[PDB]
């Protein structure tokens, strides 16, 4: 029972890995069994205190919360996979039998006439024009014959890259040559960019109501008892009745339908190039219609792992003048004229090649779960309010309560816009969805450290005299993880403006 197998090599292994002033494990165990402490310990502790050179930094005397270093370099371009604000869509009343994506594509080939979609081979700007011109002509004559399979040409074999990967040679034969095929490895990092100035216009656009009504296919309401189900159903009805009309709902429905179609076409047809519409479906004057924003092309995904990065080509429908600063990766052509009754304004066709991935589909195609944090937020505000008042004031509190947002441009100092609480829930759904698009590493690190500085402002509000030990490396990490993601640079900039507006009252900051 009480005997462990005393082996021969293990006992020579345990005697080898003891601390240094000991010979064997037996000497170590016999000293540990008869160990009594002393008070030369405090000499070792204080002798460690003396050789330290470490002082805390107060904040009432050296209130050194300087602003963050946004890179003053070239402005960061528009890097989202689709177009949000600059969109144009063609409509038709929705037919129930013709509901699959290829049927929608053909029905909009007859609705919005592509015969008039004549493109010159000279773009306004861009990089490769003949490739995109013959690509649009080739896919347009493909949709004219009602079959989604691009026949092998040099244009698609240049754009959706086939044969463009290195020859992976294992080190079993290597056939070395004297000073020929000189090989090694090399990495960089990332390139650095600057503050986006267009992000304010698309944030303000995305929270404004759009007359097309409901966009997101939600579900039906379960039946309610005499309980708090009246409360929860009432809250879902008001919040849902605000978030269905905005443009954030339109972009979420666009991602759901389009990435649904590209996703199942990534399953059912690997190795074949497809033609996929880019569309929505929303109710117009009671009659449910569908939109049509653009044309996507897959690039024969063989998705072995969760990565894989197949090639998507997007042809887009716009009615605005382009911009070599924001719309930098696009390859703007000009298509023609569109009659818009308020006269017959222009129509520009945008081009972009890009990539999606398999891990960046189940988080895009299922991005309807951005209404979970919003209602949590407004519901914690309102429930803490009636928890501090101890009286059922919810319906009248959702109308007579302000929320400070959106200071103006020339001046900031205590000139704020207080809105009603349902417009707060508009801004909250815009910011949560904006987290669901632009997530890279950089946004993750930036949200950690902004939780630190939020702790410092809350310590500033209630006069608690915060202190920190080393501030140089702190800004070295936050200025490390602000490089090139547009939401990262933007939220740092608004963090500085929060420091200015709070510096109009509290004392821990700079100008």
């Amino acid at each position: 029972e009480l005997e462990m197998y005393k082996s021969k090599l293990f006992i020579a292994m345990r005697d080898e890995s003891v601390p240094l002033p000991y010979i064997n494990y037996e000497h170590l165990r016999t000293r540990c069994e008869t160990f009594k402490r002393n008070q030369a310990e405090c000499e070792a502790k204080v002798a460690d205190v003396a050789s330290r050179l470490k002082i805390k930094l107060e904040h009432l005397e050296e209130n050194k919360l300087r602003p963050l270093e946004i890179p003053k370099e070239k402005e960061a371009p528009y890097t989202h996979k689709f177009l949000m604000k600059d969109a144009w869509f063609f409509a038709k009343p929705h037919d129930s039998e013709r509901a699959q994506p290829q049927q929608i594509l053909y029905d909009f080939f007859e609705a919005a006439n592509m015969g008039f979609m004549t493109t010159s081979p000279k773009p306004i700007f861009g990089k490769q024009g003949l490739m995109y011109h013959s690509l649009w002509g080739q896919t347009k004559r493909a949709i004219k014959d009602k079959r989604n399979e691009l026949e092998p040409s040099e244009q698609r074999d240049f754009l959706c890259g086939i044969g463009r990967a290195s020859k992976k040679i294992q080190e079993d034969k290597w056939q070395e040559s004297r000073e020929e095929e000189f090989k090694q490895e090399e990495t960089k990092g990332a390139a650095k960019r600057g503050f986006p100035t267009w992000f304010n216009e698309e944030w303000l656009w995305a929270m404004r109501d759009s007359k097309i009504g409901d966009w997101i296919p939600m579900a039906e309401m379960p039946p309610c008892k005499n309980e708090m189900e009246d409360y929860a159903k009432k809250m879902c009805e008001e919040l849902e009745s605000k978030i269905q009309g905005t443009n954030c709902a339109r972009e979420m429905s666009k991602l759901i339908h389009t990435i649904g179609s590209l996703h199942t076409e990534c399953r059912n047809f690997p190795g074949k190039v497809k033609i996929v519409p880019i569309y929505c479906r929303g109710t117009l004057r009671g009659e449910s219609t569908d939109c049509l924003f653009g044309i996507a092309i897959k690039g024969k995904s063989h998705l072995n792992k969760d990565d894989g990065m197949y090639t998507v080509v997007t042809f887009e429908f716009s009615t605005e003048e382009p911009n070599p600063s924001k719309h930098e990766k696009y390859t703007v052509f000009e298509a023609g004229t569109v009659p818009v009754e308020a006269k017959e304004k222009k129509l520009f066709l945008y081009c972009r090649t890009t990539g999606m991935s398999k891990l960046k589909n189940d988080w895009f195609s299922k991005c309807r779960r951005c209404l979970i944090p919003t209602m949590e937020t407004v519901e914690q505000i309102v429930l803490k309010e009636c928890a501090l008042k101890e009286e059922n004031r919810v319906s009248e509190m959702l109308e007579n309560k302000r929320a400070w947002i959106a200071h103006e441009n020339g001046e900031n100092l205590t000139r704020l816009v207080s809105t009603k609480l349902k417009d707060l829930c508009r801004m909250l759904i815009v910011t949560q969805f904006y987290y669901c698009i632009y997530n890279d590493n950089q946004l993750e690190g930036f949200c950690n450290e902004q939780k630190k500085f939020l702790m410092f402002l809350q310590a500033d509000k209630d006069s608690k005299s915060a202190f920190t030990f080393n501030q140089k490396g702190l800004y070295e990490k936050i200025e490390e993880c602000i490089v090139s993601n547009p939401l990262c640079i933007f939220l740092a900039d608004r963090l500085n403006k929060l420091f200015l507006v709070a510096k109009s009252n509290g004392a821990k900051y700079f100008e």
Partner: protein
């Protein structure tokens, strides 16, 4: 005549060459680690493969003989229901699932199924017969306890339950005879008068025993009185900033 059948299978499986080195080399406990050989890594995206499966036309493996005893080759407009690709087991569509559920024959088993789930119909029976009141909107909160949450009436302790199912269904290798038997053996005298003749299998019976005898005790944040009648209603009765309870009886 089942021992002749099991003697036929046991005489069958010892004929194999490399399977003789499998049994009579291991132990009885090795069955447990002979049950688990799931060489797939983690199934880290199961719903992804479920949507990838249900988007195809024939994802499902189903039995052949019963569906060719009752089914139809295609429904009335192009809806495919069968394949002939592969043991004789036939791939099919979930349209055969809803098709069986709308145009298929029926077997009367309502009392049996309403007797399997007596704990859960007991939960529905206790839910339907309660009354509520207004809300209160106050702060509330109290620590985490170890609470038995079910209105059971025997209250065994996850130890007399496994031992109980040994000495009720199959006593030929049940357990070493302990001192915890005697009044539970009067309950053995009661319970073999229940589970002797049924058409329900031994695993489903072993499942349904352990839910009418086990007060499920978990480590939960509790407040108010600690009766088990209101502990399955823990998530409904109060949150953090609000509270509702007005039950009379």
């Amino acid at each position: 005549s089942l021992l002749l059948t099991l003697a036929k299978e046991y005489a069958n499986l010892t004929k194999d060459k490399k399977s003789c080195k499998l049994l009579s080399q291991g132990t009885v406990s090795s069955y447990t680690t002979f049950k688990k050989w799931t060489t797939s890594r983690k199934e880290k995206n199961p719903s992804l493969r479920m949507r990838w499966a249900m988007g195809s036309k024939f994802p499902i493996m189903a039995n052949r003989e019963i569906l060719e005893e009752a089914g139809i080759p295609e429904q009335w407009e192009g809806i495919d229901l069968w394949s002939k690709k592969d043991l004789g087991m036939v791939l099919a569509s979930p349209a055969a699932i809803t098709y069986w559920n709308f145009c298929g024959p029926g077997v009367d088993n309502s009392s049996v199924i309403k007797d399997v789930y007596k704990a859960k119909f007991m939960k529905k029976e206790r839910w339907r017969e309660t009354l509520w009141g207004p809300m209160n909107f106050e702060l509330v909160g109290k620590q985490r306890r170890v609470v038995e949450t079910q209105p059971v009436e025997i209250k065994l302790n996850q130890k007399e339950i496994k031992e109980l199912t040994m000495w009720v269904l199959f006593e030929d290798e049940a357990n070493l005879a302990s001192k915890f038997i005697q009044e539970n053996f009067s309950l053995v005298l009661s319970l073999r008068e229940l589970y002797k003749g049924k058409a329900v299998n031994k695993d489903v019976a072993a499942f349904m025993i352990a839910h009418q005898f086990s007060p499920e005790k978990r480590f939960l944040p509790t407040f108010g009185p600690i009766r088990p009648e209101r502990m399955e209603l823990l998530h409904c009765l109060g949150g953090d900033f609000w509270k509702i309870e007005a039950v009379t009886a």
